[PDB]
Write a protein that binds this ligand. Structure first.
Ligand SMILES: CCCCCC(=O)Nc1nc(-c2ccc(O)cc2)c(-c2ccc(O)cc2)s1
Ligand SMILES: [Zn+2]
Length: 349
């Protein structure tokens, strides 16, 4: 039953919310971290969702699984390897994947993530292993992979390690910075650790994306654009609350990272209304379709397309239009960006 059986691209998906239950539950055994269940199927039920949660309830899910994988050096490279296959099974020819170095680390990170004890595995080593997993992954499954390192809203003191990690591992495989986390923290956009991590990126031409607009206000989005200088938005749904902001960003041909299934499940979208993507579709916006976290949302790429295929009208034409846009909007070098594009064109006709 796949809603769109063509090659796809995906620009908004998190490593740490795309681990197989099997693998989480594997490192749980392999190292003594007691999880809330012992066969994969009920993990995917506990560590998964089907109503709007609360925000507390959502973050706590991260408190379950993460410490099985974080701190373990091979679970790292492994979730990365497993990630890439997960995508070839979706039909994706190009993915940028994101995650926070920090939150798979247990050494040289204040504060130590997830309640872990100290350690041996630094933020910087984290990225290295992710590169390996992902780029072996590329070689066997046939996906083009870049990564993207996430700044965290509630930790602007990490942010500098993030842009500089970005610079340290550039195309190999890192292409962009992000800002992610609770976008509802008061003033987190303009916290100086972040404003400067983003000005560093401009400076040293690392590409940029931001979650804004998802669960937070139009002003979150403008801060993103005007102050952190994003090239793309993470979700951006609330953009439509500010008509000039929207209008301008339609003039600017900005890229919105839509996540349709993601958004219902978060409250981000109110099940009564006109889904924002339907607007973006009717106004010809530059958006892309994305799962965001397929673990928590017990989902796959096809699920997102299915939601819109059958709940919101979307045609094959449209589906194709948006992978196009997605490719165009990628943080790939320009030579490779047009190579993606021609793949997509030959496959699309
Ligand atoms: C309730 C629905 C709202 C959804 C929107 C939201 O706030 N998203 C978030 N993403 C992460 C996140 C980001 C990157 C990452 O690598 C892992 C998680 C959060 C996090 C979760 C736990 C935490 O300690 C801090 C932020 S909170
Ligand atoms: Zn996200």
């Amino acid at each position: 039953t796949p809603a769109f059986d063509k090659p796809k691209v995906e620009l908004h998906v998190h490593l740490d919310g795309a681990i197989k239950p099997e693998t989480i539950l594997y490192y749980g055994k392999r190292r003594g971290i007691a999880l809330p269940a012992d066969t994969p199927e009920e993990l995917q039920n506990i560590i998964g969702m089907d109503k709007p949660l609360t925000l507390p309830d959502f973050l706590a899910k991260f408190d379950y699984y993460m410490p099985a994988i974080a701190g373990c050096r091979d679970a790292i490279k492994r979730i990365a390897y497993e990630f890439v296959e997960m995508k070839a099974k979706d039909g994706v020819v190009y993915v940028e994947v994101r995650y926070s170095p920090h939150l798979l680390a247990n050494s040289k990170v204040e504060p130590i993530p997830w309640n872990q004890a100290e350690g041996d595995l630094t933020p910087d080593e984290v990225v290295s292993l992710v590169n390996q997993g992902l780029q072996e992954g590329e070689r066997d499954f046939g996906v083009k992979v870049r990564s993207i390192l996430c700044c965290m809203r509630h930790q602007p003191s990490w942010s500098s390690e993030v842009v500089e990690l970005c610079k340290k591992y550039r195309e190999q495989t890192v292409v962009a910075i992000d800002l992610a986390g609770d976008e509802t923290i008061e003033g987190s956009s303009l916290f100086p650790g972040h404003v400067q991590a983003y000005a560093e990126a401009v400076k040293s031409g690392v590409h940029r994306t931001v979650h804004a607009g998802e669960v937070g206000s139009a002003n979150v989005v403008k801060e993103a654009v005007d102050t952190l200088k994003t090239e793309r938005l993470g979700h951006g749904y609330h953009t439509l609350e500010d008509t000039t902001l929207y209008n301008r960003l339609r003039q600017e041909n900005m890229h919105f990272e839509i996540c349709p299934w993601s958004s219902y499940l978060t409250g981000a979208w109110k099940p009564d209304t006109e889904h924002a993507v339907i607007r973006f579709k009717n106004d010809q916006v530059n958006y892309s379709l994305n799962t965001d976290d397929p673990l928590i949302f017990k989902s796959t790429l096809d699920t997102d397309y299915q939601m819109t295929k059958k709940d919101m009208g979307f045609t094959e034409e449209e589906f194709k239009r948006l992978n196009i846009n997605a490719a165009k909007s990628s943080f790939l070098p320009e030579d490779e960006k047009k190579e993606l594009l021609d793949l997509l064109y030959k496959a699309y006709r």
